[PDB]
Write a protein that binds this ligand. Structure first.
Ligand code: F3S
Ligand code: F3S
Lengths: 402, 402
């Protein structure tokens, strides 16, 4: 359990907070001014499982496009909450384009991209005023890539007065937290409701992220948008995102997540959504699709045969999921095992809803299948793969019948 | 910090324990009887960064091959510690083939694959006796795929007597821990040294793994071999492994790790080593290679150009690493940033050793480069990529000079 309690903030129809499932979100990478490209990518992300979708609203042409994007989404019955990402000129764009402001379901403010000196407080105030006027929620999202330089100096001076000064790195982290907390407190004091404020304070190193979010969670009551910013490419990005989020999520900290992956060229923007879902599912926080538990396989089993069967099982579950979702409520929780030999095969298969254990070296050429913790059958000969997937189909029909 | 103190256990020349870096290991998936295939894969894994390599010693033909595998490894000056994985007949194989027993650098025992009833205690005793005779360390590795059924019943009965009985799942976890701890205690009582015992107790769900290892860490003083067993295939396997290990590793629990990925057909067995390394590096526990921090890119930057540059930078760092390792001590710690626009580009680049920030929408077409927290130059025109990699080469030569 352990979930941190928070007020509920609605982003469109999606509730965020301690009483609600942790929401997966993402961000487009098309130019927002391109209505056709951006609308298609919003739909793509939403269908992959992005419950909320953010898009940059960076200039006038972007802002003018947002109402039309929203129109086209509604025209296909797609109710996907949109978050506007504002930097530098957020106050100008919201002021000048009230239809954009109304079309968005949430505004993102970064307290480090408000402007210079005195201009900061006024810009912040205008954006919060507009959100208040329209009943919109706001994310106050700090990021250490854009840390308020005047706040850092204030905190550097406080640090230098300590009997034992902390390192420069630690003060940067202090400043990042203080940036978010101060603006949070300022928005509340201005009259913005607790039901309209989400916070983030992102850094790009996992152990720093854990420190930051523990402070945010202690010092505020807001729902928290959690992510490891600038996680990077490929396996590194995936691992770093999972490693940063897991300790916090297991502690009950975090109400919505975004995975900040750099796509490989040609790689679809949906990869980040898949990774976000896998993180939540790995930790038992949500269930999105059936999952396969499979052993690595070693010298006790024939590698090609074992690897191909596991891959075939995973492919079939993926093909059947759209249909299963529609017919079989709760099927998201399905656990299937594919195992290499007698060492752990039966035992792991018995912990799954349904599982197969192949014969390894020195074993009779037969493959026991277990369901609900006991022997269902034993398969042999050709077509082991097809016969098993039929049994999984049969199992699903019965277990997850309405 | 926070590292759990433990005695040091040497596996060949590799020390495991609280005073030592967390060791990456892996396991072969070739038939051990195939000397040529297994020797080549041991070398492959070792060169990828597997500091210790495990291989199954499942039958007589496997056991006879082990001395020859070791001979061939030494013949190329490869000092890679070998762990023998024993199940069911470990006592027979070690007794009958003393040259295999001597060729291994560690024996793995699973207290759930010893045999039936009375036969368990005697088989365990003989294997520990042989390890003691030869001065070998042992891993007592429990796995919930092979949980001792008699111990589970004992613990189920204890549970049923409680005022508030726990769930069956929780008792399985209790039994898994008790399996490892009891055998640990039995080996110590038999005379096996604290410098010769490593423990594991693996499960396939992340939140259960965290519970288990917190108990093991509290109830024992041994170094701990940490892994999420049967993690599975592709992105799911990677994410689940990272998510399970990170909370424990951040708490200071764990002295060596193995990532239990199911390879895709054709996919090299080294992928698990890469993932293990990325987990440790993501958490700042070890450094294996230069890493790139890159933003996801959004509508503020041109997607193809940004993604290609980031990919090109990552490819070049990978190509240069063998040479850099040899010439530039400490280069493993290098942090390079590749960023999409002015929002977080400069700030993140300034936290890296060296970083480039591309021009996004509405910006002048120039790309500032930062090193050691300040502006180094500004690039423009064609060949931005090549000019940046030259600057990174120059930076590395200076920063990491002997
Ligand atoms: S890694 Fe090896 S021990 Fe058997 S169940 Fe898996 S084949
Ligand atoms: S995601 Fe967008 S805000 Fe700029 S630095 Fe990265 S391009």
């Amino acid at each position: 359990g352990m979930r941190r309690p928070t007020p509920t903030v609605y982003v469109g129809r999606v509730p965020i907070g301690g009483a609600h499932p942790i929401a997966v979100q993402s961000m487009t990478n098309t130019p927002t001014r391109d209505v056709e490209a951006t609308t298609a990518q919003v739909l793509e992300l939403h269908r992959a499982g992005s419950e909320i979708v953010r898009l940059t609203v960076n200039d006038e042409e972007a802002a003018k496009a947002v109402p039309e994007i929203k129109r086209r989404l509604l025209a296909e019955g797609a109710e996907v909450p949109l978050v506007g990402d504002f930097h530098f000129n957020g106050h100008l764009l919201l002021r000048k384009y009230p239809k954009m402001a109304e079309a968005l379901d949430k505004f993102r403010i970064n307290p480090g991209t408000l402007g210079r000196g005195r201009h900061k407080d006024e810009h912040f105030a205008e954006m919060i005023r507009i959100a208040m006027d329209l009943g919109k929620p706001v994310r106050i999202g700090a990021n250490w890539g854009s840390l308020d330089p005047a706040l850092l100096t204030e905190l550097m001076d406080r640090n230098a007065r300590r009997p034992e000064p902390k390192s420069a790195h630690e003060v940067v982290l202090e400043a990042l937290v203080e940036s978010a907390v101060r603006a949070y407190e300022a928005a509340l004091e201005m009259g913005l409701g607790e039901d309209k404020l989400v916070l983030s304070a992102k850094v790009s190193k996992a152990r720093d992220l854990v420190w930051v979010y523990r402070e945010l969670a202690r010092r505020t009551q807001a729902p928290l948008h959690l992510g490891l910013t600038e996680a990077g490419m490929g396996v590194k990005g995936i691992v770093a995102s999972a490693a940063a989020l897991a300790p916090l999520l297991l502690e009950g900290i975090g109400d919505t997540i975004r995975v900040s992956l750099t796509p490989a060229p040609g790689e679809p923007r949906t990869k980040e959504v898949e990774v976000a879902q896998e993180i939540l599912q790995a930790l038992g926080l949500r269930a999105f699709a059936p999952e396969v538990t499979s052993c690595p396989g070693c010298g006790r089993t024939t590698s090609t045969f074992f690897q191909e069967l596991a891959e075939e099982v995973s492919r079939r579950l993926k093909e059947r999921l759209p249909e299963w979702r529609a017919r079989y409520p709760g099927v998201e929780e399905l656990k299937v095992a594919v195992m290499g030999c007698v060492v752990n095969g039966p035992g792991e298969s018995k912990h799954a809803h349904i599982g197969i254990s192949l014969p390894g070296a020195g074993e009779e050429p037969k493959a026991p299948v277990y369901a609900d913790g006991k022997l269902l059958t034993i398969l042999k000969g050709e077509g082991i793969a097809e016969e098993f997937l039929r049994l999984v189909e049969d199992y699903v029909k019965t277990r997850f019948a309405p």
